[PDB]
Amino acid sequence: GPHMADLLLNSTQFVQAFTYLIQNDKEFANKLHKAYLN
Protein backbone atom coordinates (compact mmCIF):
# COMPACT_ATOMS: atom_id res chain seq x y z
CA GLY A 1 0.00 0.00 0.00
CA PRO A 2 1.67 3.16 -1.32
CA HIS A 3 -0.36 6.13 -0.05
CA MET A 4 -2.26 8.68 -2.09
CA ALA A 5 0.24 11.22 -0.70
CA ASP A 6 3.26 9.21 -1.94
CA LEU A 7 2.40 10.11 -5.54
CA LEU A 8 2.69 13.86 -5.09
CA LEU A 9 5.61 15.36 -7.02
CA ASN A 10 7.07 16.76 -3.79
CA SER A 11 7.21 13.44 -1.93
CA THR A 12 10.61 11.93 -1.02
CA GLN A 13 10.94 9.51 -3.92
CA PHE A 14 10.34 12.13 -6.60
CA VAL A 15 12.48 14.93 -5.15
CA GLN A 16 15.14 12.27 -4.99
CA ALA A 17 14.46 11.34 -8.61
CA PHE A 18 14.53 14.95 -9.80
CA THR A 19 17.48 16.17 -7.74
CA TYR A 20 19.43 13.15 -8.90
CA LEU A 21 18.45 14.02 -12.48
CA ILE A 22 19.32 17.73 -12.19
CA GLN A 23 22.55 17.16 -10.26
CA ASN A 24 23.80 14.72 -12.90
CA ASP A 25 22.50 16.10 -16.23
CA LYS A 26 25.56 17.95 -17.63
CA GLU A 27 23.57 20.12 -20.01
CA PHE A 28 20.97 21.12 -17.41
CA ALA A 29 22.77 24.23 -16.11
CA ASN A 30 23.40 25.68 -19.57
CA LYS A 31 19.77 25.01 -20.50
CA LEU A 32 18.92 26.77 -17.25
CA HIS A 33 21.10 29.87 -17.66
CA LYS A 34 20.14 30.28 -21.33
CA ALA A 35 16.57 30.33 -20.00
CA TYR A 36 17.07 33.18 -17.52
CA LEU A 37 18.08 35.39 -20.46
CA ASN A 38 14.80 34.49 -22.30
Place this chain on the structure above:
Amino acid sequence: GPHMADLLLNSTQFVQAFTYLIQNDKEFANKLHKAYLNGCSNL
Protein backbone atom coordinates in the same frame (compact mmCIF):
# COMPACT_ATOMS: atom_id res chain seq x y z
CA GLY B 1 -8.19 3.27 -0.73
CA PRO B 2 -8.51 4.29 -4.43
CA HIS B 3 -6.65 2.90 -7.44
CA MET B 4 -3.31 4.72 -7.13
CA ALA B 5 -2.29 4.18 -10.73
CA ASP B 6 -5.11 6.57 -11.71
CA LEU B 7 -3.11 9.45 -10.20
CA LEU B 8 -0.59 9.16 -13.00
CA LEU B 9 -0.10 12.64 -14.54
CA ASN B 10 0.26 13.12 -18.29
CA SER B 11 3.11 15.35 -19.46
CA THR B 12 0.91 18.48 -19.59
CA GLN B 13 -0.63 17.95 -16.14
CA PHE B 14 2.85 17.13 -14.93
CA VAL B 15 4.20 20.50 -16.04
CA GLN B 16 1.26 22.30 -14.38
CA ALA B 17 1.70 20.55 -11.04
CA PHE B 18 5.46 20.99 -11.00
CA THR B 19 5.26 24.71 -11.73
CA TYR B 20 2.73 25.11 -8.97
CA LEU B 21 4.87 23.17 -6.48
CA ILE B 22 8.13 24.91 -7.31
CA GLN B 23 6.37 28.25 -6.91
CA ASN B 24 4.58 27.70 -3.63
CA ASP B 25 6.65 25.07 -1.85
CA LYS B 26 9.87 26.51 -0.42
CA GLU B 27 11.20 23.10 0.70
CA PHE B 28 10.64 21.70 -2.78
CA ALA B 29 12.21 24.63 -4.58
CA ASN B 30 15.28 24.79 -2.35
CA LYS B 31 16.03 21.08 -2.76
CA LEU B 32 15.91 21.51 -6.54
CA HIS B 33 18.05 24.64 -6.20
CA LYS B 34 20.71 22.86 -4.15
CA ALA B 35 20.79 20.04 -6.71
CA TYR B 36 21.51 22.77 -9.25
CA LEU B 37 24.41 24.28 -7.28
CA ASN B 38 25.90 20.85 -6.58
CA GLY B 39 25.59 19.95 -10.24
CA CYS B 40 27.34 23.20 -11.15
CA SER B 41 30.31 22.81 -8.79
CA ASN B 42 30.54 19.03 -9.48
CA LEU B 43 30.42 19.30 -13.28
Place this chain on the structure above:
Amino acid sequence: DLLLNSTQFVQAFTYLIQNDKEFANKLHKAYLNGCSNLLLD
Protein backbone atom coordinates in the same frame (compact mmCIF):
# COMPACT_ATOMS: atom_id res chain seq x y z
CA ASP C 1 29.82 30.67 -13.80
CA LEU C 2 26.66 32.72 -13.18
CA LEU C 3 25.17 30.66 -10.29
CA LEU C 4 21.54 31.77 -9.89
CA ASN C 5 19.95 32.37 -6.51
CA SER C 6 16.73 30.59 -5.46
CA THR C 7 14.57 33.46 -6.64
CA GLN C 8 16.37 33.50 -10.03
CA PHE C 9 16.38 29.67 -10.25
CA VAL C 10 12.61 29.32 -9.73
CA GLN C 11 11.96 31.80 -12.55
CA ALA C 12 14.44 30.08 -14.84
CA PHE C 13 13.18 26.58 -13.98
CA THR C 14 9.54 27.61 -14.39
CA TYR C 15 10.42 29.04 -17.76
CA LEU C 16 12.51 26.02 -18.81
CA ILE C 17 9.91 23.37 -17.98
CA GLN C 18 7.25 25.35 -19.80
CA ASN C 19 9.15 25.91 -23.02
CA ASP C 20 11.86 23.32 -23.52
CA LYS C 21 9.88 20.17 -24.32
CA GLU C 22 12.96 17.95 -24.39
CA PHE C 23 13.72 18.85 -20.75
CA ALA C 24 10.14 18.66 -19.47
CA ASN C 25 9.85 15.15 -20.91
CA LYS C 26 13.12 14.15 -19.28
CA LEU C 27 11.69 15.17 -15.91
CA HIS C 28 8.44 13.46 -16.86
CA LYS C 29 10.27 10.19 -17.59
CA ALA C 30 12.10 10.52 -14.24
CA TYR C 31 8.60 10.84 -12.72
CA LEU C 32 7.12 7.85 -14.59
CA ASN C 33 10.05 5.72 -13.55
CA GLY C 34 9.48 6.70 -9.92
CA CYS C 35 5.77 5.94 -10.37
CA SER C 36 6.59 2.54 -11.84
CA ASN C 37 8.71 1.53 -8.84
CA LEU C 38 6.01 2.68 -6.46
CA LEU C 39 2.98 1.18 -8.20
CA LEU C 40 4.35 -1.99 -9.73
CA ASP C 41 6.48 -2.31 -6.55
